[PDB]
Design a protein around this nucleic acid. Structure first.
Length: 156
RNA sequence: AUGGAGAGUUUGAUCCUGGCUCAGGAUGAACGCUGGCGGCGUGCCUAAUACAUGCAAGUCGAGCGAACGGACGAGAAGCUU
């Protein structure tokens, strides 16, 4: 189930010699609670198509987040442009404490044991990019030991 | 490594950069208005300004002179026994 989360409504006014438009764009985050997470937007007007074309746009790319279960396996961060996020793994019995673009990809993957020091910008585009571009750069233990050519259980 | 999200703010409309502002805590707090009872702490932060009065360091006859009062036998009676 491609779990939806909206960010905002919008209005854009292109002042010309004539008249300005009433485009109502948006941007959403679409995860699945499995470690296969996307996000999407669209220059739309319809609040359904603000979801629908963007849910279609998020289903242009669901990124593969490797999840050693129970939390996010490492103490990680994010990076895009002028913004950057941060995640520290923690206990399960906490209650998730994060924000708007830093909680979004973190809650639609079912992990719930993390931190959030959302550094960088306040523009949610490159923020939720950094929430995604950091998270896509995650790696597990078993594939890297395959990639390095050691064994999996040799790493502790 | 038990924590680390914030809210706005330069346009006709964006990104950056920037300070600024509030959301949250506390105070020997104090003030406007309010005010049940206990169980509890704290109590001139200013003038180390000036002070009436009370008033706050004494000690021991088992040191020994004194001297006083003075119980203490305490006469004859001062005969008002």
């Amino acid at each position: 189930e491609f779990e939806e989360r909206v960010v905002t409504i919008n209005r854009v006014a292109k002042v010309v010699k004539g008249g300005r438009r009433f485009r109502f764009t948006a941007l959403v985050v679409v995860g699945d609670k499995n470690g296969r997470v996307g996000f999407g937007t669209g220059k739309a007007q319809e609040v359904p198509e603000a979801i629908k074309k963007a849910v279609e746009a998020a289903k242009k790319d669901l990124v593969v987040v490797p999840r050693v279960e129970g939390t996010t396996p490492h103490t990680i961060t994010g990076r895009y442009g002028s913004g950057s996020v941060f995640m520290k793994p923690a206990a399960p019995g906490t209650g998730v404490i994060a924000g708007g673009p830093v909680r979004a990809v973190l809650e639609l993957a079912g992990i719930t044991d993390i931190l959030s020091k959302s550094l960088g910008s306040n523009t949610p585009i490159n923020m939720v990019r950094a929430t995604i571009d950091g998270l896509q750069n995650l790696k597990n233990a078993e594939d890297v030991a395959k990639l390095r050519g050691k064994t999996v259980e040799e790493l502790y």
